[PDB]
Amino acid sequence: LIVTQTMKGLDIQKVAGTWYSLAMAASDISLL
Amino acid sequence: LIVTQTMKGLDIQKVAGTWYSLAMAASDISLL
Amino acid sequence: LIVTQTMKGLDIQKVAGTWYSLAMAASDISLL
Amino acid sequence: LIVTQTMKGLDIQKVAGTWYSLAMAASDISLL
Amino acid sequence: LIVTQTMKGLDIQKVAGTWYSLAMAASDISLL
Amino acid sequence: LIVTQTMKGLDIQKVAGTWYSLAMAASDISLL
């Protein structure tokens, strides 16, 4: 398993809330 | 398992809330 | 397990709240 | 002549160019 | 002549260029 | 001539360029 996540040139504003993650990677992921 | 997360040129403003993580990586991840 | 998280050129302002982590990595991660 | 210009809650981003004025008021105005 | 210009809660980012004025008021104004 | 310019709660970032004025007021103004 190979994960390559690249982000370039991002503009985030007024994102009031519960922002968990911009980029996420794992072997196993579960949201309840 | 290989994880490569790169971020370049980011502008975050007025993100009032509960920002957990910009970049996240793990073997196992669970959100309840 | 290899984790490589790089961040370059970041501008964060007015992020009043409960900012936990910009970059996170672990073997196991759970949020309740 | 009465001018009342109010602005509340504004979000301006990536406005690269020649932004002259957000709010303008005058007796006389000419653009060549 | 009365001019009342109020601004509240403004978020300006990445406005690279030749930003002249946010709020402008005059008796006479000409742009060549 | 009365001019009342008020600004409250401003967030300006990454405004690289030739920012002339945030708030401007005059009797006469000309741009060549």
Side-chain angles (χ1 to χ4, degrees), chain C residues 6-25:
Chain C
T6 72
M7 277 79 69
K8 300 155 188 180
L10 278 72
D11 316 306
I12 303 129
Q13 78 152 345
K14 301 301 290 187
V15 171
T18 303
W19 178 287
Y20 274 4
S21 80
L22 199 139
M24 183 176 282

Side-chain angles (χ1 to χ4, degrees), chain D:
Chain D
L1 182 137
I2 295 186
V3 180
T4 303
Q5 314 174 346
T6 72
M7 277 79 69
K8 300 155 188 180
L10 278 72
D11 316 306
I12 303 129
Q13 101 182 327
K14 301 301 290 187
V15 171
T18 303
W19 178 287
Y20 274 4
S21 80
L22 199 140
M24 183 176 282
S27 167
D28 181 8
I29 294 169
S30 286
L31 273 93
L32 275 303

